[PDB]
Amino acid sequence: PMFIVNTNVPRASVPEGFLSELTQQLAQATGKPAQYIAVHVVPDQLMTFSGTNDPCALCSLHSIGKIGGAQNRNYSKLLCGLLSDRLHISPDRVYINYYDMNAANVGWNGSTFA
Amino acid sequence: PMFIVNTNVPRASVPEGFLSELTQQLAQATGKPAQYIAVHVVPDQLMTFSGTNDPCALCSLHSIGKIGGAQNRNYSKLLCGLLSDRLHISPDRVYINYYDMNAANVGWNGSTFA
Amino acid sequence: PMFIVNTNVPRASVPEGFLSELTQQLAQATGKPAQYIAVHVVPDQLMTFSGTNDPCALCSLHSIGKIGGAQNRNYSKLLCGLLSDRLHISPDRVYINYYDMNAANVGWNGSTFA
Numbered sequence A, B, C: 001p002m003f004i005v006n007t008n009v010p011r012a013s014v015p016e017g018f019l020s021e022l023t024q025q026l027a028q029a030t031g032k033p034a035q036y037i038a039v040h041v042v043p044d045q046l047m048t049f050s051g052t053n054d055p056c057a058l059c060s061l062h063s064i065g066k067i068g069g070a071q072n073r074n075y076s077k078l079l080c081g082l083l084s085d086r087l088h089i090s091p092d093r094v095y096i097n098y099y100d101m102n103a104a105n106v107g108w109n110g111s112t113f114a
Ligand SMILES: O=C([O-])/C(F)=C\c1ccc(O)cc1
Pocket: A001, A002, A032, A036, A037, A062, A063, A064, A065, A101, A106, C095, C097
């Protein structure tokens, strides 16, 4: 799976072990090995949410399976919790897009996952 | 909805209230109150379109509903007009990807929109 | 089509004609005219793969057509090849997401392809 976070929060505020933490947290939550988890954090972005430039985040979680109604609800609680505590972004100023990818549509190591 | 613009135009060429203008324009175009709109602009990018580095943009518009065939033509006219007028990007050097998102696949405020 | 590469490799490590090379290579692989190919490269990113900060890359290829199980395996070999040779990123530290876009959901030149 891969997780991307875009936020207007300055780089200086992103905690040092934040990416490794997200890796651990996601492994547990999706039940996928940490070896297949990729995390991408983009701070200092020029963004607005509800028309204001208060701290916000636009996130994306791509996974082959483990995506769905209940699972996504649990990912949102966990993820909003982490952004809130580590980056101090209010949970209602965060949008997370969930994508269930077909194995044939994910390339890796010179081939695909199918 | 959320709208993302990636462009090789420098940060300095992005007008001061442009994100607010985008927010207002999209609220009118989609019919969704500005309160539900997030905008993200990424300037200074390393990109080529048709093999050249003249000004260009790659955008994404995600919405829960309000997305579809004929309506996307309208969005393209509006959006390209704005980037042309404001950032001086030629319409033929702009791509916009449109995504209709399922509410169960959008996380917000600790849960999903489902 | 449009191709995006996000990497933690430094900007100075990206060879001069890389975007132009990707344009030709893509035109060749997909059969699409270079005129319609957009390339976006984002170096110096804060990202981890498998929990480590070693060179990695997260990419996306969007196309209207020319996307399929067999074609994607082919694109992946070519693309992981170029990234290893040119940016020295190990192929097992590269993800490429593939998207077959409906012509109606791709805006260009103030309209859509449908
Ligand atoms: O989640 C997975 O099964 C995985 F190991 C990798 C992955 C990479 C990119 C994606 O878009 C989704 C999954």
